């Protein structure tokens, strides 16, 4: 209910929304023009899916709590609770899973020969499937939509831990295993290099993932797992809406490693041979 805090948080949310919007929009525009002007490289099939999923994240998430934190209340039906919470958590979960899927696809394709869209479906389906327990989790209002909502007495102390587990432990350790299997990068014996790029992109992606997702979930645990959350003042208010930091960067993180789209975006800043021959001969 703090007025200056409300103004500051609205400013921060709008700024991060427009930042992620501009970044993702330009990246996806470059991807679309490359795909139209060339190949629908599967390398990019995912980065484009990342673009679309993350822009959907921005659109389906920032605007709702924008509506609450501006109007400071709720003025709609009840099923809008279900709809909004679904369309909000879906982006958070699906982004992580599709990162998982693209890491797995690259992991197989480190040395995979030719193999003539599935794993993106895997990620999307797994997301929509794990979108189940929120049905019986969020409770009813007691004025503003679904306030004082709790899954159970253990809903705020076991389901939150399960959320944390499913959002980090499988994802971050899974991707960790993904790159560490490239440890066997030395194949084909000795030469009759790439290790630097591999390690440099792996480290960057893992650290940005963990650091960006750290604060929201850490305050989540310190406010949910711990009864009587220690802080209700200003420092928590702004930080509890900053998890979208990687949204404007992780697509850039992947685009940096792709030498194709990188040269493309750098160009769009203002947007010795011979021949075979033949002869005859004498018979006998």
């Amino acid at each position: 209910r703090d007025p200056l805090l409300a103004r500051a948080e609205l400013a921060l949310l709008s700024i991060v929304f427009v930042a992620v919007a501009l970044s993702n929009g330009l990246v996806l525009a470059a991807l679309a023009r490359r795909g139209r002007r060339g190949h629908w490289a599967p390398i990019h099939v995912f980065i484009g899916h990342l673009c679309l999923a993350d822009l959907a994240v921005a659109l389906f998430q920032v605007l709702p709590q924008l509506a609450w934190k501006a109007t400071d209340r709720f003025r709609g039906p009840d099923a809008l609770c279900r709809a909004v919470k679904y369309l909000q958590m879906v982006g958070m979960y699906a982004s992580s899973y599709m990162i998982l899927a693209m890491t797995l696809d690259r992991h197989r394709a480190i040395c995979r020969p030719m193999l003539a869209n599935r794993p993106v479906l895997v990620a999307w389906a797994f997301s929509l499937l794990l979108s189940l327990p929120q049905l019986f989790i969020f409770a009813q209002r007691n004025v503003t939509d679904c306030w004082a909502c709790f899954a159970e007495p253990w809903g705020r102390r076991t389901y939150v831990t399960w959320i944390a587990l499913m959002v980090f432990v499988a994802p971050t350790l899974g991707i960790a295993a993904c790159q560490v299997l490239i440890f066997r990068e030395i194949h084909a014996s000795l030469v009759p290099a790439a290790v630097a790029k591999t390690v440099r992109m792996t480290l960057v992606i893992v650290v940005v993932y963990v650091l960006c997702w750290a604060p929201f979930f850490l305050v989540q645990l310190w406010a949910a797992w711990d009864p009587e959350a220690p802080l209700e003042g200003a420092p928590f208010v702004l930080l509890m809406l900053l998890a979208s930091l990687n949204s404007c960067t992780n697509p850039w993180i992947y685009a940096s490693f792709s030498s194709s789209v990188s040269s493309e975006l750098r160009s769009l800043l203002c947007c010795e041979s011979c021949t075979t021959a033949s002869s005859s001969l004498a018979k006998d």
């Binding site: 209910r1 409300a6 909000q88 958590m89 929120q134 004082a148 939150v160 406010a223 208010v237």
Partner: peptide, 9 residues
């Protein structure tokens, strides 16, 4: 706030 009890503004 997304999946937790957000403080009321």
């Amino acid at each position: 706030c997304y999946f937790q009890n957000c403080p009321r503004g």
